[PDB]
Amino acid sequence: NQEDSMIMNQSSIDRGLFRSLFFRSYMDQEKKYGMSITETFEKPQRTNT
Amino acid sequence: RGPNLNIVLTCPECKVYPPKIVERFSEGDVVCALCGLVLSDKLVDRVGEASNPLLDGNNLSTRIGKGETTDMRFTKELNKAQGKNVMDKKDNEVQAAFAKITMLCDAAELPKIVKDCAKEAYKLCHDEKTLKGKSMESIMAASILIGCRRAEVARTFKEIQSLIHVKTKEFGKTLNIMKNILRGKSEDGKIDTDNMSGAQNLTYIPRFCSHLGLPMQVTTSAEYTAKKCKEIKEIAGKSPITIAVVSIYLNILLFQIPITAAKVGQTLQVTEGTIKSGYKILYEHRDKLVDPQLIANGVVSLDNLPGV
Amino acid sequence: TLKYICAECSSKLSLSRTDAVRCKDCGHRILLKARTKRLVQFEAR
Amino acid sequence: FNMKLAINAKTITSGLKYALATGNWGERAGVSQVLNRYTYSS
Amino acid sequence: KKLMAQIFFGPTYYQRLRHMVDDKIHARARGPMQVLTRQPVEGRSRDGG
Amino acid sequence: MIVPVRCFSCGKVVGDKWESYLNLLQEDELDEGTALSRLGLKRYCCRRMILTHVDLIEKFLRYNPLEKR
Ligand SMILES: [Zn+2]
Ligand SMILES: [Zn+2]
Ligand SMILES: [Zn+2]
Numbered sequence: 295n296q297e298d299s300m301i302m303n304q305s306s307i308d309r310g311l312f313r314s315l316f317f318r319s320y321m322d323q324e325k326k327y328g329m330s331i332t333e334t335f336e337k338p339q340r341t342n343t
Numbered sequence: 344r345g346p347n348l349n350i351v352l353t354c355p356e357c358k359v360y361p362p363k364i365v366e367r368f369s370e371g372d373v374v375c376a377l378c379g380l381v382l383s384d385k386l387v388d389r390v391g392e393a394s395n396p397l398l399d400g401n402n403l404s405t406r407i408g409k410g411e412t413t414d415m416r417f418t419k420e421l422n423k424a425q426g427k428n429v430m431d432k433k434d435n436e437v438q439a440a441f442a443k444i445t446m447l448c449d450a451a452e453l454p455k456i457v458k459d460c461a462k463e464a465y466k467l468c469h470d471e472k473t474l475k476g477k478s479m480e481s482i483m484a485a486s487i488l489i490g491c492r493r494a495e496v497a498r499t500f501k502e503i504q505s506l507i508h509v510k511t512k513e514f515g516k517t518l519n520i521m522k523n524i525l526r527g528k529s530e531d532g533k534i535d536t537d538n539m540s541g542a543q544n545l546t547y548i549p550r551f552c553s554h555l556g557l558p559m560q561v562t563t564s565a566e567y568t569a570k571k572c573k574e575i576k577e578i579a580g581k582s583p584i585t586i587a588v589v590s591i592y593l594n595i596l597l598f599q600i601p602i603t604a605a606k607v608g609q610t611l612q613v614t615e616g617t618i619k620s621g622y623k624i625l626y627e628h629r630d631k632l633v634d635p636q637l638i639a640n641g642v643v644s645l646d647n648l649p650g651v
Numbered sequence: 652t653l654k655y656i657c658a659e660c661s662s663k664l665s666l667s668r669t670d671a672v673r674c675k676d677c678g679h680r681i682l683l684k685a686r687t688k689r690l691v692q693f694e695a696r
Numbered sequence: 697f698n699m700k701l702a703i704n705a706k707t708i709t710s711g712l713k714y715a716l717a718t719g720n721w722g723e724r725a726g727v728s729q730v731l732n733r734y735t736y737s738s
Numbered sequence: 739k740k741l742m743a744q745i746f747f748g749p750t751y752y753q754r755l756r757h758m759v760d761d762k763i764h765a766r767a768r769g770p771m772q773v774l775t776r777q778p779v780e781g782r783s784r785d786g787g
Numbered sequence: 788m789i790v791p792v793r794c795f796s797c798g799k800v801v802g803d804k805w806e807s808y809l810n811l812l813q814e815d816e817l818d819e820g821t822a823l824s825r826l827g828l829k830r831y832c833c834r835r836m837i838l839t840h841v842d843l844i845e846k847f848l849r850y851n852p853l854e855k856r
């Protein structure tokens with residue numbers, strides 16, 4: 295714990311001390327590039343993509 | 344008709360063609376999936392500006408403006424000199440048309456996809472021998488109509504005429520010409536789906552109901568009534584606007600909303616006599632014009648519809 | 652088709668790639684993909 | 697004269713949106729920021 | 739065995755801060771390069787140097 | 788959000804005493820110190836576990852379920 299470090303109890307951590315949830319969100323849109331080219335949400339195959 | 348200048352990555356050792364190639368982007372490598380040999384290394388993943396090469400083609404231009412220190416004299420004259428360029432004059436006409444299309448599409452509260460399609464329709468259909476004796480207003484109004492239809496948010500002729508002052512005859516002839524041009528460049532150079540057809544009445548109902556402030560349940564019933572209204576030959580030939588309005592009116596009185604035909608026709612700019620005239624035809628087939636579930640539950644009964 | 656859930660009326664829907672993203676009952680425009688029905692394993696630590 | 701074209705509602709709508717989306721108070725910087733939601737006190 | 743000294747011991751309110759090491763540790767042997775200068779790219783999230 | 792199962796420091800089970808703790812506070816009109824000792828929580832490590840717990844799950848339960856069966 296020298297020089298601004300600390301010792302934490304592993305047993306306390308095991309029981310849930312200072313445990314947290316993390317959430318991350320991902321955004322995506324189906325853009326239309328004018329009148330001809332358009333995108334779609336799909337599961338692409340290796341033979342056509 | 345030109346030099347090849349094509350690079351194809353293949354494994355010299357495996358010699359299998361075409362090869363299995365994996366792009367280890369994190370490692371910056373292109374490696375043969377079978378033997379592991381690396382084929383190319385040091386692959387690459389504001390300093391520039393973006394442009395759309397579908398509405399502007401190839402045209403790089405830069406503006407002239409003030410800086411942190413600037414004299415108005417130089418700015419005024421440089422803009423004066425830049426305006427007098429003969430080559431850029433041709434495309435400025437298209438850009439000016441784009442500006443007015445954007446203004447019309449923005450004053451109409453239309454989505455960005457609509458104006459992009461409208462501008463693309465203008466560019467493709469412009470600079471052709473067929474559309475040279477027609478007013479630019481007809482061209483713009485027709486392009487906007489096409490753009491709205493391509494976006495599945497199509498409007499009506501009257502709605503577009505509310506902004507762009509063009510009478511019906513020129514509007515129709517220009518629209519027919521532009522559609523032929525787009526079809527012509529679709530084959531030689533897609534364009535249309537089930538939506539391109541004129542009637543497509545089901546698309547109008549949600550907005551017409553919104554203008555009247557009806558609940559969503561009535562709108563869905565109106566859509567069902569309009570969808571089934573095409574089985575009757577005595578009404579099927581009517582305009583899609585009347586087909587949608589009469590169906591909406593039929594449901595308005597079915598759920599007993601206190602809105603009279605005098606205002607329904609005044610709001611949707613449709614003659615009241617036409618509304619009531621069409622309503623009479625949409626009374627001999629009521630059992631086929633009301634959703635079975637709604638009558639089954641008990642929300643609506645057919646005796647709430649007055650009979651003449 | 653795949654099953655979704657309305658975010659306001661909690662109605663379970665079945666949409667295809669052609670159907671519009673909207674609740675056919677109440678008209679909401681936000682749908683929640685239903686939870687997967689395959690079991691998921693978790694350590695109790 | 698078409699009153700629907702004489703008045704462009706987009707002028708008011710964009711100017712207020714652009715100035716609030718960015719911090720650029722014009723047509724000063726940093727006037728609008730993404731609200732911290734890391735914790736209630738934040 | 740007893741510690742020769744006596745320890746100041748009691749409850750204190752501590753807070754878990756936003757900085758976690760697992761969101762900072764990153765190493766690069768080789769990886770993508772920038773298009774212009776052809777040097778390692780910037781950013782841990784992009785496998786940068 | 789909900790009561791911890793164990794005391795962080797020593798691991799004594801404290802997740803079976805929340806309702807007993809609340810009932811002592813409400814119906815018996817006991818002070819929180821007396822209630823903590825009546826529940827058998829002697830070490831101050833265990834006392835702060837129940838004394839400083841915020842029951843947020845009650846707030847979360849006010850929102851209507853995302854998916855009803
Ligand atoms: Zn190989
Ligand atoms: Zn719903
Ligand atoms: Zn304890």
